[PDB]
Amino acid sequence: SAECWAALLHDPMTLDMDAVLSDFVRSTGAEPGLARDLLEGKNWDLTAALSDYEQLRQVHTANLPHVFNEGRG
């Protein structure tokens, strides 16, 4: 029984702006300037910035009236 609960990983100590910057760019594919700008607007909360960027990248049936392919769920 390992990592079954949580296992607090991916954290430097509390927050390092340069580490949060580099990982964002690595995890989203965004540029470092855009990364820094989003991060200042998220209080440099890494996961919040990751989730924000990918959300505006998802677009959940916002453009088309009804997006229904042969999907699972």
DSSP code per residue over the chain: --SSS----S-SSS--HHHHHHHHHHHH---HHHHHHHHHHTTT-HHHHHHHHHHHHH--SSSSS----S---
Query: Distance from first CA to last CA of the chain, Å, rounded?
Result: 29
Q: How far apart are CA 61 and CA 41, in angstroms?
A: 26
Burial class from Cβ neighbours inside 10 Å (0-12, 13-18, 19+) for residue 25 reads middle
Resolved by:
NMR
Question: Are 57 and 63 a contacting pair, CB within 8 Å?
Answer: no
Structure tokens at 61: 């049936």
Domain of 43, in residue numbers: 1-73
Domain of 14, CATH number, reads: 1.10.8.10
How many domains does the chain divide into?
Answer: 1
